[PDB]
Design a protein around this ligand. Structure first.
Ligand SMILES: CC(C)Cn1c(=O)n(C)c(=O)c2nc[nH]c21
Ligand SMILES: [Mg+2]
Ligand SMILES: [Zn+2]
Length: 338
């Protein structure tokens, strides 16, 4: 409701892919998540679905945001707000609206918001090599992701004023909780190819086969019937959050560059600490004294981004993202100059 002018302007056209997330960051003084969250959640009528107070929502968003470390160059609440923005953009797509149920939407927007809560700016392999308490707690398995999901629920249901799930019927909540957990866990990168390949084999290939029969009468019905099964909506949701999570390369050039600087600095920090403690260095390439950020981005894009967005774009139709990805890939290439 009552929001300072500058912040109101910063939340300009959050519906467009081109969005100045850094101006929101500055305007909100490192509190972009509560502002974009409230607006996004309202535009999607989430409390009206969970039966919560716009006041209980604020308390929730506030506690989740506070548990994102501002000190992290990359994994701070701004990254979360950015992922939330990409998620809403995807949910707003015809293909997605025509495939997911409102409860999947709720799961996605919430998953995006909490997916990295309390991230320490270190990778899972680092926590394991160090014997960090979280690594011991989670038996060196999907350490951070399990933690984001768990801590999130502990903060939410641990206080009546934060519990945006308080007024839900056990069954509905139970299903929403499982969906949220599934999406957060799906962000662990070691499972990257498993998730993308399943999406390609169960969504893109079968759909191309049906779309060969043209776009006639019952044809479409057969298509919509197949895409809406619980199994497929799950694979679609996993793909959606994964793509929102690493969508930086598909953003306007200025933003793309900033995101690359932030994540790189976070990785360099870790490398300096690993060698300092004599711990095994996991990202030998990510050393601030040896690593070329543009070349690293190129490799990153070729390895994870290209094929994954290829598949996502074929299913949802995202020319804007693909054009940005091409332009940015060319920029990093153009910076060679040598
Ligand atoms: C290898 C990948 C899982 C981690 N990773 C990376 O290496 N670079 C360079 C990124 O920009 C990036 N953004 C998210 N994850 C990233
Ligand atoms: Mg994560
Ligand atoms: Zn993330």
């Amino acid at each position: 409701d009552d929001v300072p002018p500058r912040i109101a302007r910063a939340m300009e056209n959050e519906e467009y892919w081109d969005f100045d997330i850094f101006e929101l960051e500055a305007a909100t003084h490192n509190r972009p998540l509560i502002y974009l969250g409230l607006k996004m959640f309202a535009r999607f009528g989430i409390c009206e679905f969970l039966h919560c107070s716009e006041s209980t929502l604020r308390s929730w968003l506030q506690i989740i945001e506070a548990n994102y470390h501002s000190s992290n160059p990359y994994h701070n609440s701004t990254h979360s707000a950015d992922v939330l923005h990409a998620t809403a953009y995807f949910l707003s797509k015809e293909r997605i609206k025509e495939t997911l149920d409102p409860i999947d939407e709720v799961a996605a927007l919430i998953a995006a918001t909490i997916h990295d809560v309390d991230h320490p700016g270190r990778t899972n392999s680092f926590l394991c090599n160090a014997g960090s308490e979280l690594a011991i707690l989670y038996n060196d398995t999907a350490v951070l992701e399990s933690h984001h999901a768990a801590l999130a629920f502990q903060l939410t249901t641990g206080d009546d004023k934060c519990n945006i799930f308080k007024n839900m019927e056990r069954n509905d909540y139970r299903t929403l909780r499982q969906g949220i957990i599934d999406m957060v866990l799906a962000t662990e990168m070691t499972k990257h190819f498993e998730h993308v390949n399943k999406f390609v084999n169960s969504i893109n290939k079968p759909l191309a086969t049906l779309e060969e029969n043209g776009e006639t009468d019952k044809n479409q019905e057969v298509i919509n019937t197949m895409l809406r099964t619980p199994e497929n909506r799950t694979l679609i949701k996993r793909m959606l959050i994964k793509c929102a999570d690493v969508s930086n390369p598909c953003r306007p050039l200025q933003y793309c560059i900033e995101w690359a600087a932030r994540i790189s600095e976070e990785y360099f920090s870790q490398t300096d600490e690993e060698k300092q403690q004599g711990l095994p260095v996991v990202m030998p390439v990510f050393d601030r004294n040896t690593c070329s950020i543009p070349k690293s981005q190129i490799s990153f894009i070729d390895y994870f981004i290209t094929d994954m967005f290829d598949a996502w774009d074929a299913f949802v139709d995202l020319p804007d993202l693909m054009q940005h990805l091409d332009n940015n890939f060319k920029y990093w290439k153009g910076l060679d100059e040598m």
